[PDB]
Amino acid sequence: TIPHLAIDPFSLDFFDDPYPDQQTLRDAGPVVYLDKWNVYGVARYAEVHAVLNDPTTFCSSRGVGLSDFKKEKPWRPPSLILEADPPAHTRPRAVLSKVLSPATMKTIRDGFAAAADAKVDELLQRGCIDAIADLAEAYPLSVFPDAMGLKQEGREHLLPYAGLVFNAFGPPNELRQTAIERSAPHQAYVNEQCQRPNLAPGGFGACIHAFTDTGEITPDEAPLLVRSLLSAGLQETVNGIGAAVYCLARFPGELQRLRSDPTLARNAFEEAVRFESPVQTFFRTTTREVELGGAVIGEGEKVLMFLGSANRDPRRWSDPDLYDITRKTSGHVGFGSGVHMCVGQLVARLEGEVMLSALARKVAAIDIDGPVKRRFNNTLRGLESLPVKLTPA
Numbered sequence: 001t002i003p004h005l006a007i008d009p010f011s012l013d014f015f016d017d018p019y020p021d022q023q024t025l026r027d028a029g030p031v032v033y034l035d036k037w038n039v040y041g042v043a044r045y046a047e048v049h050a051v052l053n054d055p056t057t058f059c060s061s062r063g064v065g066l067s068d069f070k071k072e073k074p075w076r077p078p079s080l081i082l083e084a085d086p087p088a089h090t091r092p093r094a095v096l097s098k099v100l101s102p103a104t105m106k107t108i109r110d111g112f113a114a115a116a117d118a119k120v121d122e123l124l125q126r127g128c129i130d131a132i133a134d135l136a137e138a139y140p141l142s143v144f145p146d147a148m149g150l151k152q153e154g155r156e157h158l159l160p161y162a163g164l165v166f167n168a169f170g171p172p173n174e175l176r177q178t179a180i181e182r183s184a185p186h187q188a189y190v191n192e193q194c195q196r197p198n199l200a201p202g203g204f205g206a207c208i209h210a211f212t213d214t215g216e217i218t219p220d221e222a223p224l225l226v227r228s229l230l231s232a233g234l235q236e237t238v239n240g241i242g243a244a245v246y247c248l249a250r251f252p253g254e255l256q257r258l259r260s261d262p263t264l265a266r267n268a269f270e271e272a273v274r275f276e277s278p279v280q281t282f283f284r285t286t287t288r289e290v291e292l293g294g295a296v297i298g299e300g301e302k303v304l305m306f307l308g309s310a311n312r313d314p315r316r317w318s319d320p321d322l323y324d325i326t327r328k329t330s331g332h333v334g335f336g337s338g339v340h341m342c343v344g345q346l347v348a349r350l351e352g353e354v355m356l357s358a359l360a361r362k363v364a365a366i367d368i369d370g371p372v373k374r375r376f377n378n379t380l381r382g383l384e385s386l387p388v389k390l391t392p393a
């Protein structure tokens with residue numbers, strides 16, 4: 001009663017243009033079986049939203065990649081928040097929520113915003129730039145690692161470790177094995193910067209270590225929670241900002257609208273997050289037999305959620321393939337939904353908003369003027385290179 005498909009959502013051809021295959025996955029049925037990896041798939045907004053919001057039946061403590069932690073060893077000690085279920089998840093989540101609080105955004109906002117303006121001002125002096133390396137990448141590297149409290153040496157390890165983390169959610173294909181065999185130096189730098197003496201006072205990491213006397217987490221838990229923010233805190237944002245820029249370059253009517261009202265910047269980024277879904281997919285594991293969209297899924301089965309496909313589901317979105325900076329984006333799953341919904345979304349939206357605001361005030365046109373290149377990853381969607389000519393306003 002469940003349609004079996006041979007689509008590999010982790011193949012290179014799929015990454016190259018996922019969107020037809022995602023329609024085929026949505027239209028086959030509410031639940032599909034993916035024979036290549038032996039997992040269930042859900043690609044419609046409805047079923048994705050349901051799975052995300054039933055963490056008792058679709059837990060994350062057996063991993064949220066293909067590997068089931070009850071069967072295989074994880075490639076690194078489990079995250080205390082991503083790879084945990086309530087109740088063990090609850091208090092480490094409260095710590096990271098407070099570390100990344102509204103009050104904390106108040107303190108870095110003007111710094112983040114200035115750095116966005118300085119970066120756009122700097123790129124307008126060059127004209128022809130690469131909006132991935134010189135912007136999408138350069139901007140978050142200039143404000144996140146300082147906000148984390150990190151030393152300066154070794155920062156070249158952060159994006160590679162992020163790409164490793166997201167590649168290791170995927171199946172044991174060559175992208176994953178090659179990331180793991182390249183991993184050791186990045187693992188080593190990251191784990192070391194998680195120790196309390198290496199985290200500059202006032203930053204996010206020091207704050208995490210300072211939350212250890214409340215009975216919410218203990219001191220030996222602090223290093224791993226810092227690790228979370230060195231894993232999840234960079235590449236997505238970069239991909240999300242690279243997508244905004246791309247969209248603004250590819251849809252010049254939306255750039256003309258952003259310029260006319262820069263207050264649209266925040267929702268313009270939110271729309272980029274929905275349109276690109278930098279995190280394309282996550283897994284859950286069933287803790288019990290369950291009925292999902294008229295199928296009966298046994299205990300201990302991996303379920304693949306297509307988040308980017310739920311964000312383009314014509315059953316939920318009008319013209320889902322169009323980038324509309326005035327769209328009501330509320331409800332998209334680009335950040336998840338429910339108990340694990342991105343705990344750092346306030347940092348991402350603040351980075352992306354102030355970047356787009358900067359562009360909206362200072363740029364008249366953005367024109368692709370060279371070969372666009374994609375970056376392949378088992379979990380992340382984003383560009384490798386996006387040569388643009390920026391035109392000062």
Ligand code: HEM
Nearest residue numbers: 081082232233236237240334335336340342343344347348
């Ligand atoms: C556009 C940028 C981002 C996107 C698209 C994104 C995507 C996601 C998604 C889909 C989830 C839910 C995972 C799940 O349900 O298993 C998540 C959770 C998480 N994110 Fe983000 N994220 C972004 C930025 C950030 C930032 C800036 C941080 C840190 C500052 C961060 C740290 C985390 C952590 C620690 C979790 C785990 C939360 C939990 O398990 O309860 N992410 N992210």
Ligand SMILES: COc1ccc(C(=O)O)cc1
Nearest residue numbers: 079081082227228231232
């Ligand atoms: C959604 O992406 C991630 C990746 C890693 C972690 C973590 O290491 O906790 C959390 C979220």
Ligand SMILES: [Cl-]
Nearest residue numbers: 076077187190
């Ligand atoms: Cl690691």
